[PDB]
Write an enzyme that holds these catalytic residues in place. Structure first.
Site, mmCIF file in Angstrom:
data_model
loop_
_atom_site.group_PDB
_atom_site.id
_atom_site.type_symbol
_atom_site.label_atom_id
_atom_site.label_comp_id
_atom_site.label_asym_id
_atom_site.label_seq_id
_atom_site.Cartn_x
_atom_site.Cartn_y
_atom_site.Cartn_z
ATOM 1 N N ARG A 54 -8.362 -0.066 -4.210
ATOM 2 C CA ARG A 54 -8.314 1.340 -4.577
ATOM 3 C C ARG A 54 -9.703 1.927 -4.513
ATOM 4 N NH1 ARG A 54 -7.161 4.430 -10.061
ATOM 5 N NH2 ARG A 54 -5.802 6.117 -9.297
ATOM 6 N N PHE A 59 -15.398 9.092 -7.390
ATOM 7 C CA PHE A 59 -14.906 8.543 -8.649
ATOM 8 C C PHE A 59 -15.269 7.066 -8.744
ATOM 9 C CE2 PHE A 59 -10.845 7.590 -11.291
ATOM 10 C CZ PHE A 59 -11.623 7.349 -12.401
ATOM 11 N N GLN A 62 -12.382 0.179 -6.887
ATOM 12 C CA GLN A 62 -11.744 -0.804 -7.749
ATOM 13 C C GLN A 62 -11.347 -2.046 -6.970
ATOM 14 O OE1 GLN A 62 -8.704 0.726 -10.303
ATOM 15 N NE2 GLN A 62 -7.919 -1.311 -10.872
ATOM 16 N N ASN A 101 -8.474 -2.165 -17.095
ATOM 17 C CA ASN A 101 -7.566 -2.780 -18.055
ATOM 18 C C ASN A 101 -6.264 -1.993 -18.112
ATOM 19 O OD1 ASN A 101 -7.678 -0.670 -20.124
ATOM 20 N ND2 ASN A 101 -9.800 -1.341 -20.485
ATOM 21 N N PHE A 112 -14.267 -1.977 -11.723
ATOM 22 C CA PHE A 112 -14.601 -0.889 -10.834
ATOM 23 C C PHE A 112 -16.077 -0.590 -10.867
ATOM 24 C CE2 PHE A 112 -14.751 2.317 -14.234
ATOM 25 C CZ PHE A 112 -13.919 1.768 -15.186
ATOM 26 N N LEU A 121 -14.322 7.579 -19.822
ATOM 27 C CA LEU A 121 -13.950 6.179 -19.954
ATOM 28 C C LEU A 121 -14.676 5.479 -21.072
ATOM 29 C CD1 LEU A 121 -13.903 5.122 -16.219
ATOM 30 C CD2 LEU A 121 -11.972 5.890 -17.598
ATOM 31 N N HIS A 125 -13.207 1.366 -21.658
ATOM 32 C CA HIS A 125 -13.496 0.338 -20.668
ATOM 33 C C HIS A 125 -14.869 -0.259 -20.964
ATOM 34 C CE1 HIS A 125 -10.069 1.366 -18.015
ATOM 35 N NE2 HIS A 125 -10.228 2.556 -18.565
#
Length: 163
Positions: A54, A59, A62, A101, A112, A121, A125
């Site tokens: 991904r 952004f 991942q 997660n 990521f 986040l 995370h």
């Protein structure tokens, strides 16, 4: 004395370049050790040969699902999952390395690399490292992503280990 690990990245099998990471073992030693050991493969499994499934430009990238290659799999060196160690470090801009997660205390192997500040986040995370060399290679990786995250070419970790 914090460890540094590297990924050699390939695009449809063709070498792109190397990105190295500083892991903050001084702050989140348990989480850092999981990533380090998965990068060397010393426990018998790990990141070598796995893909980034991904990539969303602007952004993050991942990866780390080395068992199902699509975001549903992975495991840690401690078992299927492990706890959120702490949230001392924040998502302060591009280059931050953070655990993916699926709720509280469900860390595995997926992670990521941020390519933006992602403050929302924070506290959800665990941040555990940063890009130390090769941010340009991450920026070149982005160009193969898309809005929904699907990649136009296969982006793999051709080799990895500790420096």
């Amino acid at each position: 004395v914090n460890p540094t690990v590297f990924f050699d990245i390939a695009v449809d099998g063709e070498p792109l370049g190397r990105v190295s990471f500083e892991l903050f073992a001084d702050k989140v030693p348990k989480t850092a050790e999981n990533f380090r050991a998965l990068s060397t493969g010393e426990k018998g499994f790990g990141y070598k040969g796995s893909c980034f499934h991904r990539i969303i430009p602007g952004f993050m990238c991942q990866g780390g699902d080395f068992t199902r290659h699509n975001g549903t799999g992975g495991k840690s060196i401690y078992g299927e999952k492990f706890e959120d160690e702490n949230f001392i470090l924040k998502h302060t801009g591009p280059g931050i390395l953070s655990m993916a997660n699926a709720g509280p205390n469900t860390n595995g192997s997926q992670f990521f690399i941020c390519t933006a500040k992602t403050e929302w986040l924070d506290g959800k995370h665990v941040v555990f490292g940063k890009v130390k060399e090769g941010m340009n290679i991450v920026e070149a990786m982005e160009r193969f992503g898309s809005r929904n995250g699907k990649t136009s070419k296969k982006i793999t970790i051709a080799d990895c280990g500790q420096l």
